[PDB]
Design a protein around this ligand. Structure first.
Ligand SMILES: Nc1ncc2cc3cnccc3cc2n1
Length: 338
């Protein structure tokens, strides 16, 4: 199907003319369209694959966004605005306001270089504010990651930069919005055992101990460190290796979580069953190091960020910092009148 109905020049619902593809996924694609009933405004349309799993998630996303856009019509809390939805040759399509590049695509197109710290501060504040708004509404996002944080506009300036010895684009406006509510779950809804893209998955999720709002905070921690480094901090598709990476960076997992998990697979006698002298052992031993060794400067602003990240990456979800608390963290002081 989808190839046949998402091409450039196609008209959806007698209204939206497809210009180009913005992104694609296993869920389907997002295309930029010209809205001919609204004077030519460009919009984004998500065309969802006709697979039950993804239809369910799309119907779900629509319910959630009706709730949020009603609660917050002006988008004070930076959730993307849904404009409408329709069916088109058996595919659910959801129309959104058009935004710029995701934070992932920006990093990628900049050669996997990090953001500047002042931009990270602004973006981090907005992300925390947005997701804390979700948390206030008895929702957990579950799939936060740089692909799901989008710049409102990705206009830019380009300057030669002898630090990188290369030309470089700098964002004008670092404002962002959060997208993708298809996994968002209410406190009183059923909680699936597997959630999150694996690189941003919390230890309570990996160990199947239950999860709720705090698993978003873990994800945000992961995001912030990737903005700082410009690469993914847990580059792996194996759950055991992932846990090994956590140990190398954050230290060993709390005994009480280990004893409690149904996945005794990963462990022997209250410690991770992992051979450091193995090959993957040495991969982890060199791709990963203690959190604070990732710092590129001893300047206090850097230390403030790393303190915050550390608190986000607390193993025990019951002890992990909440976004309410995180928004008062000293790292954000520079954004406030003192
Ligand atoms: N450029 C752009 N603008 C709006 C978007 C909304 C989206 C809503 N859900 C998922 C992905 C999305 C990607 C988007 N990309």
């Amino acid at each position: 199907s989808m190839h046949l109905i998402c091409q450039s020049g196609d008209v959806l619902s007698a209204r939206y003319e497809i210009v180009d593809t913005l992104g694609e996924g296993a869920f389907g694609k997002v295309v930029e369209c010209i809205d001919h009933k609204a004077g030519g405004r460009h919009v984004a349309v998500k065309i969802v694959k006709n697979v039950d799993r993804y239809c369910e998630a799309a119907r779900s996303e629509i319910q959630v966004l009706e709730h949020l856009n009603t609660t917050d019509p002006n988008s004070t809390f930076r959730c993307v605005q849904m404009l409408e939805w329709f069916e088109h040759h058996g595919h659910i399509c959801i129309v959104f306001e058009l935004l710029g590049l995701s934070t992932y695509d920006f990093i990628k197109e900049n050669g996997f270089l990090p953001f500047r710290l002042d931009h990270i501060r602004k973006m981090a504040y907005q992300i925390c504010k947005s997701v804390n708004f979700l948390h206030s509404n008895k929702l957990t996002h579950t799939d936060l990651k740089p692909e799901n944080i989008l710049f409102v506009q990705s206009d830019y300036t380009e300057a030669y930069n002898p630090k990188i010895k290369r030309d470089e684009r700098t964002l004008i406006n670092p404002d962002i919005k959060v997208v993708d509510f298809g996994s968002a779950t209410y406190d009183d809804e059923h909680h699936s055992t597997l959630v999150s893209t694996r690189h941003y998955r919390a230890p309570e999720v990996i160990l199947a101990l239950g999860w709720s709002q705090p698993c978003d905070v873990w994800s945000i921690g992961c995001i912030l460190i990737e903005y700082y480094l410009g690469f993914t901090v847990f580059p792996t598709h194996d759950s055991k290796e992932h846990l090994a990476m956590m140990e190398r960076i954050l230290g060993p997992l709390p005994k009480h979580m280990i004893q409690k998990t149904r996945k005794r697979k990963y462990f022997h006698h209250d410690r991770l069953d992992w051979d450091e002298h193995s090959s993957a052992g040495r991969y982890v031993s060199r791709a990963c190091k203690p959190l604070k060794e990732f710092m590129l400067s001893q300047d206090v602003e850097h230390e403030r960020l790393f303190d915050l990240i550390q608190k986000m990456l607390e193993y025990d979800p019951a002890k992990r910092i909440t976004l309410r608390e995180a928004l008062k963290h000293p790292f954000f002081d520079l954004l406030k009148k003192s």
